[PDB]
Amino acid sequence: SGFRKMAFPSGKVEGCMVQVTCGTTTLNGLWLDDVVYCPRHVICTSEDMLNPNYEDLLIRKSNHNFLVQAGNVQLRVIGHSMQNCVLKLKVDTANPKTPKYKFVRIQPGQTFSVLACYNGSPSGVYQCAMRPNFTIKGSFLNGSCGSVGFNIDYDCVSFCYMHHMELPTGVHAGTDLEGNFYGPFVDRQTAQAAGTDTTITVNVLAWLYAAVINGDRWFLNRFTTTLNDFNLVAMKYNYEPLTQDHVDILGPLSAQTGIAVLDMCASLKELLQNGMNGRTILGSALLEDEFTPFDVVRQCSGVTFQ
Amino acid sequence: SGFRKMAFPSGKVEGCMVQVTCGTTTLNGLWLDDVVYCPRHVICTSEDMLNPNYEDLLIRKSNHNFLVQAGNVQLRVIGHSMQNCVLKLKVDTANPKTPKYKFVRIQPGQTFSVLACYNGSPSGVYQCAMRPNFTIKGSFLNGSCGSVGFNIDYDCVSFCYMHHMELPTGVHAGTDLEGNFYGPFVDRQTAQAAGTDTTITVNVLAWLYAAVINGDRWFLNRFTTTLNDFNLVAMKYNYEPLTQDHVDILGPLSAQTGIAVLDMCASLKELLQNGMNGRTILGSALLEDEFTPFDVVRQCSGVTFQ
Ligand SMILES: *[C@H](O)[C@H](C[C@@H]1CCNC1=O)NC(=O)[C@H](Cc1ccccc1)NC(=O)OCc1ccccc1
Ligand SMILES: *[C@H](O)[C@H](C[C@@H]1CCNC1=O)NC(=O)[C@H](Cc1ccccc1)NC(=O)OCc1ccccc1
Structure with missing residues (x-):
């Protein structure tokens, strides 16, 4: 575990x-x-x-x-x-x-690994998410430009990100491997607006399922909710709207844990409205949103590569 | 940044x-x-x-x-x-x-990377710390035994950890590469006590310096303290005692930021006594202790390997 x-x-x-x-x-x-x-x-x-x-x-x-x-x-x-x-x-x-490789353009909310490099030599590797506003919150010093983000599927590396710049706000921006920026950004040393970010709601729910799987379950309430009612709460707290496509993607985790998605939404609603009261979930005091449902399934099924 | x-x-x-x-x-x-x-x-x-x-x-x-x-x-x-x-x-x-490789037995509070593997094939990599109580908080499923932890120094891999078991509390235990367990643990499927864990105080301070370097500085107070007075606070909050050896190790970060170590201790004291009041530091709502002072220096100086 x-x-x-x-x-x-x-x-x-x-x-x-x-x-x-x-x-x-x-x-x-x-x-x-x-x-x-x-x-x-x-x-x-x-x-x-x-x-x-x-x-x-x-x-x-x-x-x-x-x-x-x-x-x-x-x-x-x-x-x-x-x-x-x-x-x-x-x-x-x-x-x-x-x-074996492919170039892919990922969607906001998806995750990938970054191999941070300087002068052509790898320095470190970490996981992160393409934010809804098409920035990433990385660790990039001078000379890190050209470092790549990627996913692996068995033997195939899917390159999705190349690092280009740090915005004056300190968040990071870059392109797919055809050179198209994610987001509205240009490769010019000018001040550039990222715009409002939002929390990846389907990722937070996947992480809550991860938590239940791993024994952390205090947040499970005795309420349920509806999609429209939950989404009303999501917009107040800058969470991205939850769709039925999102509900379908959470299905396997719903089936494993025996917790309906809307029951988990009601737990997330009460977490959003009442805070965490100084408790923690999977070792964090914040709602984590950089795990996709597939990230979670892969981690607690032990999928390997090469 | x-x-x-x-x-x-x-x-x-x-x-x-x-x-x-x-x-x-x-x-x-x-x-x-x-x-x-x-x-x-x-x-x-x-x-x-x-x-x-x-x-x-x-x-x-x-x-x-x-x-x-x-x-x-x-x-x-x-x-x-x-x-x-x-x-x-x-x-x-x-x-x-x-x-190029070496076998090393690391000290509690030091950090290393784990390459999680199943059936001999790598699944993922993450960083963690040897807790003061000689457990690690990893991600290990059935079949992960024999996965290793390691550090790299340019071209030399220093192997320090091999995974053996999950304790009934869900934390992880293992050996160095000469087969000596870290901690009091034995390779027997019996209930085994890890004992009280403590927070790695010198790592928390290094991370606070990391935060200052990266613009997060609200926690910097207009107080200072002494070693004996800070350590009085540390024992109440289950932080490991801060020594002068720890102060010396924090020197380069002290010199870079212009913040005396004891001034940073006074900030950590007020964080421990008054909480974080719903703010965050480097994106976390908790005091992080799995970055060594060398981890911090290496990350914001961009040291590479191979
Ligand atoms: C490339 O290695 C470097 C990586 C930066 C440095 C620290 N963190 C990072 O992500 N980035 C750059 O140097 C590029 C250079 C460039 C050249 C021509 C057109 C566009 C960009 N830009 C950059 O990241 O500048 C930092 C910055 C911060 C705030 C406002 C403007 C620029
Ligand atoms: C080895 O791959 C496996 C890894 C465990 C499974 C899930 N998480 C892990 O870290 N561990 C084991 O199967 C060993 C087997 C063993 C055999 C002979 C002597 C000692 C250990 N033990 C283990 O981790 O058991 C889990 C456990 C939990 C609570 C109480 C006892 C044992």
């Missing part, structure tokens, strides 16, 4: 991390087959950031201006192009460590 | 995980050079658990009774022995993926 915020094993992704340098800027790249992917602002100087014309800046670059380091191997760059906000460098050697 | 509970990149450890079977029992083993390490209770049946005579049980086994699976390769077992609570199986092939 026990329940922890667990990241995927990172070895498959470690073997794909390279160092990309163009001018004075060095960041991380992702090396799959004979292509290296990285944020296009690798070509920006200091002045360039406030108002970059990426097309004009890229035209001043040729293949030999991009230095790509894989540990200590050089890839020769034999072509380059810009795809949205990512640069794709064609190299002369396919990564011998390329895992 | 940002601060997250970060595990080490697990790739170096992934390549060492094997499946060990003896009779009906299958668990994880750790394959380094030509030796495989695993919990000795792999030789136990169901009845054996309550009162195992490990010496007598092991004598009924020969080399060919141990089935070792590395993905799909067999190691031939050419020798076996029991070292404290671990079994060491000599195999005919050295692991081609053996990292």
Whole structure:
């Protein structure tokens, strides 16, 4: 038993991390087959950031201006192009460590593992959620740009996130691996509004089921509620609306625990209206929302990979 | 910026995980050079658990009774022995993926990453602390035994923990890689007392420095205190005594932030006596104690490995 915020094993992704340098800027790249992917602002100087014309800046670059380091191997760059906000460098050697992989654009509320890297070398791995407002609450220092987020399904790494920037509020923003930002953000050093975040209600419910499975059950009340009545409470507390699709997704956890979803909603309603009164649930004094229903099922069924 | 509970990149450890079977029992083993390490209770049946005579049980086994699976390769077992609570199986092939490694026995309050595994295959990775009472609060299902905890220093994996059991209270217990349990525990399916746990005070202070570094600073008060006066508060709240060795370890964080350690103790005193009043620190509504001072320095200096 026990329940922890667990990241995927990172070895498959470690073997794909390279160092990309163009001018004075060095960041991380992702090396799959004979292509290296990285944020296009690798070509920006200091002045360039406030108002970059990426097309004009890229035209001043040729293949030999991009230095790509894989540990200590050089890839020769034999072509380059810009795809949205990512640069794709064609190299002369396919990564011998390329895992089975896919590029996916995840939905808000979904979770993934981040392999934080600096100068092309992995530093650490942690799990997090794409917020409803398309930011992530990560741990990214200078040089972490180009670090990736991912999920694993048996042998297949599904890359979904590449890190580009920290907003002036200190939250993090980035793209899918086709270079399209999540959210309204642009790769410009300007102040940018993330907008109101909300709590991922279906994830909180999944975590409450995780808690029941693991013996923590004081919050189970002797009430039930309806969808419309619960959702009335959700909007007051900035929780995202609960749909029947959400109810269906919680089904297996409902069947395992013998607790109807709407009964669990009534417990969450009373938690939201009356607080936790200094108690804890799975070791936290807050309602946790970065576990999907699949995260929970996977953790207490012990699904493995490689 | 940002601060997250970060595990080490697990790739170096992934390549060492094997499946060990003896009779009906299958668990994880750790394959380094030509030796495989695993919990000795792999030789136990169901009845054996309550009162195992490990010496007598092991004598009924020969080399060919141990089935070792590395993905799909067999190691031939050419020798076996029991070292404290671990079994060491000599195999005919050295692991081609053996990292630079060491066996270390960690101190209570130190942290490490766990690579949770089932049937020899990695499932997930998370960070945690050896509690003062020599348990860990992990996530371990049936078949997770033999999963390891570890730290990395550049290229060297320092193995410090192998998982053996869940106590009836649901916390977790295990050994170093020489097979000596952390704590008073034995590998017997009996009820066993962990004893009173305490909060790792020096880790809480390191995390408060992490918070200041990352903009969270409401808790900084206009008080100071002394060691003896703070420690008086610590014992009332089951915090481990703060020593000058602890103060010295917090020095670099003191110098970075410009906050004397005893000034931070006075903030922690008022947090302990008056609660948090519904505020949060680095996203948590509780005082976090599973970050060492070195964890904090490493996270906000971006130290890398391999
Ligand atoms: C890239 O490694 C780095 C990662 C930052 C530093 C600390 N935390 C992070 O997530 N980010 C950057 O340097 C980029 C650079 C850039 C260049 C050209 C166009 C857009 C961005 N930007 C960035 O994160 O700046 C921080 C910031 C904070 C507040 C307002 C503006 C910018
Ligand atoms: C090994 O994979 C397994 C891991 C447990 C299961 C769920 N969570 C865990 O950490 N543990 C065991 O099966 C061992 C077996 C054993 C055999 C011989 C001597 C000692 C132990 N024991 C165990 O964890 O049992 C759980 C338990 C709970 C409460 C009281 C006694 C035992």
